[PDB]
């Protein structure tokens, strides 16, 4: 404490000042923090402050009030849970930030995602955890080539293919929560591919959907 306990009054001050329309005031106290912070060899409080940072810069300024306010909370629970010394605390913020990456990705939000899978890989690479780092690569590779499909016109057999493929991926690390937010897109998918007249590429997508679904189950 001391200096990180100065951080995160800042922080309280940041989220204080969003949740009530100033975005311009948070800033500059997440740069007074950002300022303290270089002033107490972390390096990994440094980085999410930054990260918090151009949060506010990107979804704040816009309409998103609600989802800046929520990288600073992240970036405040993480300081904080750095004054108790506390690594069973580390990890349901770990918890809560990759669950917000998934909702992230469903909603189809491409400011806040980048902004918690940093916070993610930073919480990560700080809790020698590597079934939390292979699935952020694999929802990274997912979520680009889905935004690049959705922007071209490729055809259904490409994004199926895309969605097969990060579904083997997750299969074989064996993520869960991971999961079931791809079993919703496949079945929106699906009814996509019902919609349209062909056939032969339904089967192979109910199939998939069932066998995804049985090894959630025993997951
Ligand atoms: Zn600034
Ligand atoms: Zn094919």
Redesign the pocket.
Known sequence: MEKLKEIVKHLEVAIKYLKEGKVDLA??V??DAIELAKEAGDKASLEILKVA?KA??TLGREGKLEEAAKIVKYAKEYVEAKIKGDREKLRELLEKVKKDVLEAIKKGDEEFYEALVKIARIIAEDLGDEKSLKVLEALEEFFKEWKRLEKEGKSLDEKLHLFLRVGERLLEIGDKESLEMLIELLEELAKEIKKAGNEELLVRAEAAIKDIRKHIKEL
Do not use: C, F, S, W
């Open positions: 800033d500059l997440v740069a940072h506010i810069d």
